[PDB]
Amino acid sequence: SSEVEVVPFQEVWGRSYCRALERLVDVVSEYPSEVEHMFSPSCVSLLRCTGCCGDENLHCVPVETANVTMQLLKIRSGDRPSYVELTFSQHVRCECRPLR
Amino acid sequence: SSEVEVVPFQEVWGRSYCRALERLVDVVSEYPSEVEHMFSPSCVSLLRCTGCCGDENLHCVPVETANVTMQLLKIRSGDRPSYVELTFSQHVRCECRPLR
Numbered sequence: 001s002s003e004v005e006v007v008p009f010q011e012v013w014g015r016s017y018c019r020a021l022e023r024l025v026d027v028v029s030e031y032p033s034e035v036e037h038m039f040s041p042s043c044v045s046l047l048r049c050t051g052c053c054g055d056e057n058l059h060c061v062p063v064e065t066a067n068v069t070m071q072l073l074k075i076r077s078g079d080r081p082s083y084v085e086l087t088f089s090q091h092v093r094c095e096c097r098p099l100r
Numbered sequence: 101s102s103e104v105e106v107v108p109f110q111e112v113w114g115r116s117y118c119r120a121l122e123r124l125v126d127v128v129s130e131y132p133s134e135v136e137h138m139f140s141p142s143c144v145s146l147l148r149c150t151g152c153c154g155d156e157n158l159h160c161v162p163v164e165t166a167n168v169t170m171q172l173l174k175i176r177s178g179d180r181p182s183y184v185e186l187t188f189s190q191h192v193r194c195e196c197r198p199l200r
Contacts, residue, residue, distance in 0.1 A: 043152040052143040
């Protein structure tokens with residue numbers, strides 16, 4: 001009864017090995033340059049390549065990307081709230097490759 | 101059309117609202133103090149409360165935690181590789197609450 005399940009090494013490794021994983025990211029952070037924090041929600045759910053690779057010199061990178069357009073509330077100090085449509089980058093498939 | 105789908109505000113908000121989300125985390129950083137990166141995989145998949153709360157004053161926190169025991173490979177410069185069972189903290193349910 002006090003004995004817990006152990007996730008086997010193969011599963012552990014496979015679960016955390018490089019993949020397109022849903023992550024919640026700060027909207028403003030997705031912008032190239034500084035941009036005032038006037039978005040609601042302030043964070044969105046995007047698929048981003050994540051994972052370790054086992055090989056030190058290797059890291060998880062996208063081999064295929066796409067797009068997702070989301071409707072957010074823009075709240076700038078000086079204007080009336082307004083909805084806007086923003087297209088964000090999506091990472092569809094990932095693979096371990098040579099960092100640099 | 102050549103028209104793309106727009107994820108409506110309600111869905112966007114709900115998707116990024118405080119929740120227990122699978123995240124890949126560095127094993128060593130789950131340790132209180134400094135530990136040598138002697139684990140393989142170096143990162144594991146854990147449920148972690150993540151999300152924005154519509155208010156800078158509120159933050160996503162767990163209201164329920166649990167455990168997951170995983171089998172990893174310990175590799176120390178000096179010992180022969182060896183499998184070990186590591187128990188990690190799991191976040192089961194999450195909620196937005198006042199900062200600190």
